[PDB]
Amino acid sequence: METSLLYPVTNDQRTDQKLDGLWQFKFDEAGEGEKSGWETGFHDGVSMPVPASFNDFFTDKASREYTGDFWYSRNFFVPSAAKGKALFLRFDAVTHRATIFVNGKEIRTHEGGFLPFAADISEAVKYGAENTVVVKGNNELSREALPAGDTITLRNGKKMVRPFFDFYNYSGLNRSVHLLSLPQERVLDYTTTFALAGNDATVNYTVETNGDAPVTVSLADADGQVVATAQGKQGALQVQNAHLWQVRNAYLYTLTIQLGDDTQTPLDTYTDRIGIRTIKISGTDILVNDKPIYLKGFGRHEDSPFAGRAFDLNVEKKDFALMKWIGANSFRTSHYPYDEQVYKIADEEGFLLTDEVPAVGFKMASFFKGPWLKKLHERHIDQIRDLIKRDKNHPSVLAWSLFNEPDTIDENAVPYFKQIFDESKDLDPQGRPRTFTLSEDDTIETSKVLDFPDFYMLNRYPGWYHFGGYQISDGEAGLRDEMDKWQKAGVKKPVVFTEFGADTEAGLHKLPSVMWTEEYQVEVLKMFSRVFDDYDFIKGEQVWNLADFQTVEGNMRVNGNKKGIFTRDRQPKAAAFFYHDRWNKLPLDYKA
Amino acid sequence: TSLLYPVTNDQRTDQKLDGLWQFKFDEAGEGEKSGWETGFHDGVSMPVPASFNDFFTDKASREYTGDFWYSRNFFVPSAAKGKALFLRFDAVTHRATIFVNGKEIRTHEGGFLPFAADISEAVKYGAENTVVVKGNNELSREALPAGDTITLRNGKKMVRPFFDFYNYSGLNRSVHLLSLPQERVLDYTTTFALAGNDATVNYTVETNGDAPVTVSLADADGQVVATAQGKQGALQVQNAHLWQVRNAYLYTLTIQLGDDTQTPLDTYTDRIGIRTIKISGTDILVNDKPIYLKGFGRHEDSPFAGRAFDLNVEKKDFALMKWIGANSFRTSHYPYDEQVYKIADEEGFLLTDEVPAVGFKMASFFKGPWLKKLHERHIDQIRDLIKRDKNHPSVLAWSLFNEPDTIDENAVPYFKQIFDESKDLDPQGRPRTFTLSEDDTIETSKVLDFPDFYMLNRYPGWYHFGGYQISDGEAGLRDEMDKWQKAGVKKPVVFTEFGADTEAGLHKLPSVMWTEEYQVEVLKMFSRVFDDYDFIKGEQVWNLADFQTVEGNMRVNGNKKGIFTRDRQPKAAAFFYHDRWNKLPLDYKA
Numbered sequence A: 001m002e003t004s005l006l007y008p009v010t011n012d013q014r015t016d017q018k019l020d021g022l023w024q025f026k027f028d029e030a031g032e033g034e035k036s037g038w039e040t041g042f043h044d045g046v047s048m049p050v051p052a053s054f055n056d057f058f059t060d061k062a063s064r065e066y067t068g069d070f071w072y073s074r075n076f077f078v079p080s081a082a083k084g085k086a087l088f089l090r091f092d093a094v095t096h097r098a099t100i101f102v103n104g105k106e107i108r109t110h111e112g113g114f115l116p117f118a119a120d121i122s123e124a125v126k127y128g129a130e131n132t133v134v135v136k137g138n139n140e141l142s143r144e145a146l147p148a149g150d151t152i153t154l155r156n157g158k159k160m161v162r163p164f165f166d167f168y169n170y171s172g173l174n175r176s177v178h179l180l181s182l183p184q185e186r187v188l189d190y191t192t193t194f195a196l197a198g199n200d201a202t203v204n205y206t207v208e209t210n211g212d213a214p215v216t217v218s219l220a221d222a223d224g225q226v227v228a229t230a231q232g233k234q235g236a237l238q239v240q241n242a243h244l245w246q247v248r249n250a251y252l253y254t255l256t257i258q259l260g261d262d263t264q265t266p267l268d269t270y271t272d273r274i275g276i277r278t279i280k281i282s283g284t285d286i287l288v289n290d291k292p293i294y295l296k297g298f299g300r301h302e303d304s305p306f307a308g309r310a311f312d313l314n315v316e317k318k319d320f321a322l323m324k325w326i327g328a329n330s331f332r333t334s335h336y337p338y339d340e341q342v343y344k345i346a347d348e349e350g351f352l353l354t355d356e357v358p359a360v361g362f363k364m365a366s367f368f369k370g371p372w373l374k375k376l377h378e379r380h381i382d383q384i385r386d387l388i389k390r391d392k393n394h395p396s397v398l399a400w401s402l403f404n405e406p407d408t409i410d411e412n413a414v415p416y417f418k419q420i421f422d423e424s425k426d427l428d429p430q431g432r433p434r435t436f437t438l439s440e441d442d443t444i445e446t447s448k449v450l451d452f453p454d455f456y457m458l459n460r461y462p463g464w465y466h467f468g469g470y471q472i473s474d475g476e477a478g479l480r481d482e483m484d485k486w487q488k489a490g491v492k493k494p495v496v497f498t499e500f501g502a503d504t505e506a507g508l509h510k511l512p513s514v515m516w517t518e519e520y521q522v523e524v525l526k527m528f529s530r531v532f533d534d535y536d537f538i539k540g541e542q543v544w545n546l547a548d549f550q551t552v553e554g555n556m557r558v559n560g561n562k563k564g565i566f567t568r569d570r571q572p573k574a575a576a577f578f579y580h581d582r583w584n585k586l587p588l589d590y591k592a
Numbered sequence B: 001t002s003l004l005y006p007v008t009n010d011q012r013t014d015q016k017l018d019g020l021w022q023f024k025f026d027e028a029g030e031g032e033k034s035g036w037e038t039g040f041h042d043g044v045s046m047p048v049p050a051s052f053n054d055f056f057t058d059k060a061s062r063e064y065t066g067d068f069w070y071s072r073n074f075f076v077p078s079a080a081k082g083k084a085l086f087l088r089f090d091a092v093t094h095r096a097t098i099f100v101n102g103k104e105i106r107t108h109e110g111g112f113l114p115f116a117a118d119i120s121e122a123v124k125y126g127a128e129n130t131v132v133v134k135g136n137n138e139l140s141r142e143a144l145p146a147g148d149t150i151t152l153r154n155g156k157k158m159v160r161p162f163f164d165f166y167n168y169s170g171l172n173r174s175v176h177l178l179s180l181p182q183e184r185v186l187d188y189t190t191t192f193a194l195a196g197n198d199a200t201v202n203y204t205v206e207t208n209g210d211a212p213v214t215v216s217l218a219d220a221d222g223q224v225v226a227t228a229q230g231k232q233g234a235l236q237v238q239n240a241h242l243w244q245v246r247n248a249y250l251y252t253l254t255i256q257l258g259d260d261t262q263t264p265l266d267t268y269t270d271r272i273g274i275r276t277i278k279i280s281g282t283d284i285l286v287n288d289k290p291i292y293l294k295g296f297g298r299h300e301d302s303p304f305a306g307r308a309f310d311l312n313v314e315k316k317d318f319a320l321m322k323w324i325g326a327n328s329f330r331t332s333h334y335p336y337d338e339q340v341y342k343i344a345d346e347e348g349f350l351l352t353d354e355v356p357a358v359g360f361k362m363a364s365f366f367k368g369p370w371l372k373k374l375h376e377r378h379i380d381q382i383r384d385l386i387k388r389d390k391n392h393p394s395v396l397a398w399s400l401f402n403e404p405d406t407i408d409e410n411a412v413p414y415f416k417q418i419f420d421e422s423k424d425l426d427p428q429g430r431p432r433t434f435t436l437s438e439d440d441t442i443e444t445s446k447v448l449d450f451p452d453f454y455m456l457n458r459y460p461g462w463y464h465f466g467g468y469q470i471s472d473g474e475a476g477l478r479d480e481m482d483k484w485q486k487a488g489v490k491k492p493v494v495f496t497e498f499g500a501d502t503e504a505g506l507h508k509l510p511s512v513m514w515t516e517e518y519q520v521e522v523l524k525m526f527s528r529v530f531d532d533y534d535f536i537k538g539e540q541v542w543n544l545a546d547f548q549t550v551e552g553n554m555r556v557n558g559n560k561k562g563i564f565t566r567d568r569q570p571k572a573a574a575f576f577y578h579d580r581w582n583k584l585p586l587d588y589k590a
Ligand SMILES: [Cl-]
Pocket: A125, A126, A127
């Protein structure tokens, strides 16, 4: 029930100072952190950068694999000019679980390590003095929290995780920490939808505030020129001769919201950039601004060698440099909400994102049978609400993914899907498509939930998990056989392939190819391309993965996952040049 | 004028302008005639801090040499009207001109030390303002680090450095928006003495007014243990907790301006360590006991940021250096981000702080009309470095050149001058030195009287007597070590470069150069030599991690002499030092 997830801005009514830097850090295996006073703060631990996953900074494995309570400590200054304002610490992500103490006093908890949350500390600090913030984070996985997984205990006592997902359990203060001072009466939320008529457009907005003061809304273009204004919390901004936002061709207008009448100084100002564009599913078409498009891309994680799962602006800007070069125009934020700065860059660069909530693991290799479904569901729907509230105004969000590879064959999955889909059908004012990925075991013959998603996202791995090597010929025929069945039943919704590919160890070559070589990656991708091109209802290809990424140790995991088109260092495998050639030859309206 | 690191309290603010700026190349040099100083948004987004080179897919951009432009909007709070407003640039590589709201404020030379611009009268308090930076990354023999800029037959400009590392350029370190008091602390100094279990911090405080000064020192739990009034004074610490190698203890210093009656005018706080540094003949003494240096050998180089400071890589580099048993490193070949020293202070490492006086030699140099301006910029960057890093307990010595061409008798006037103009800059009077290249030896070097201790760069078994010849290379190194011993060497000797390129994964039995085994073989050889001579008081191997470099047929995608890979995983040579260095006590050879 987060009152507001607006991204921090700086103006005369709102301040935002980052608390990033080095913190004190201590493990707590015994769980006696609070018994012995760590919540008042400490400086007898190890320095830990923020934001950063804490796991890879340690040379010993038990610390890399640590599972339990852990503590971050820091001092921060509160200016005396802040007295009277609404004061918040905004945590952009604490994986997975956090209790926040300021000066020894408990402020709040939070569940879910991938969305932001703020702590009202207005009453917990001395103004004009140094205060202390302590974070008691937790790490464990259970089937009652997203991402789904288990926590086991080695015979020697140490806890460790057995995830139901691929990626590594990178943990800790994974994203920035802000100190905010906001007006007492302020903007909490706003919403935008768009309509196009001829060369003109209309933004339809609403604004939520914690009070009754008047609301002025003003829309300015790229050069600061005001082009529409309106009064009140509902309204319609008329933009004549609009500059539409276009795939791989962004145009962003600045939106400005202010509280007060013209006898006041503005009691609050908020500011955000939005793109004027519309998204419709029509038949099997995905329409952006009423012309069909064809998705090309990935397939991503937030993973980097030094930050773990933490947001790094350098790695993010290179991922976009690469993705623009290679011809992509879309990617899915698998398998969890990304740092907010990523959606701002997709807006700036004209990319189409599939925003995913962290519901991986709904799949035991009897899931929906059990009793952890009650608590799991609360957290799932709550994480879906907060995700849609945070990112709804980004032009680059195209669709919401509400599961990843859930067990759709279990008939008991249908009551759960009915509930999730019912409870979310109206969260997004733009009413974009809501979907999920179907795993390989989940086909037109075996899935029970094919009626729900607004378009289809298939995860197919012929040539890797099935029909590998010289059997690849049988795998293509068996995929063509499935795609034949969709066609017969007459798919009325678009189909998008969202995973496929091949683990590839850069530098491994063979002629002829063998699984794991660079040549085999290309043969596999060429094979998929031949299938995609032979069916009109296939409307996009998102390969797995963009880069190689870290993973739980295992005998099938050559240090992480290696399915990337690029290495973890962000350099290209042979498959990168394949797609660089294919994707820059496919137009935006491919198949139409 | 002041290089103090920004702090946050009720008198001083500090807000980073890091994030995505706008970016454009200006190969033509038309940017100012085109009105770009007023800000622009028609370029490409570029992270700050970070080198811009590695974000482009084309080589022409990656290698670009000339004028480049950064542009950003920022907000100046109404509440800041009346304070001294500053844009502080932590590093702009290598040249900058600063514009605010289209108005040219300031320029700067040198790409690895911070500078501040007073923008108090160039902004609209309470609205958005524009900052534009016009950077240049050309090299010449008149600027540090030294090199040349050439034009290809196709018009494009290209740099050809006199040093190894790549020409990573742009906004390589954070940008701060500061709010300072009108009367404020500008500088302070610390020196230490010991007596029994007691110590004496001897301070001074530079100010730009006459208001009274008040200094207080508190221990790690916040208890106050000494106060004093006046711009000079001595704090008496009873039963002091000394700052020890790999065993730091940091007191908090608090400078406060204003008399007992008024509102405080300025507060400045820093963390210092109580410890002394003396060169006693051939020993290096920290707190009057002899130490033995072990370490690297470093660069500020990471895959995604390039030259730019990245706190994740830095804490990881420090995690590794403690794991391996090291206790020192040299900031080759330029001052590092200021965070590196604060971590060094908290972890009790000893740093050799190096100014970017690299490439003073060609493949002569001191016999050219470029020295006059070169020397201006050289001694100025020396002054800025010592002024910035003075107060760190962890800075052990200053390095004033890396591999200058000391064979020519003309180097001697220039050294004479550099060494006289730096004589009395560091209040602690720590030792000033420089690295001697392979060609500069006891037989051939002409500047051996100057340094306070000797830093040796030797590459037997790599650039000479490679492969099966290594045994003759070991013999030659002992030859030279015999001649030092003969010459009655009275100052300490520290090996500060040695090693071997190693491609992680290349194995051979028996070894060949470039394999992991050969590297261990080479490092074992150097160890055997170091252990048979008493004046040798330190081994700093080159390099800590594989770092990026100019393209060349001898550069297998950058330098590869690193004990760790560019991703910071170990090569077999990691475990050799992990064994050796964790068995040498801190007083080895005493
Ligand atoms: Cl208070």
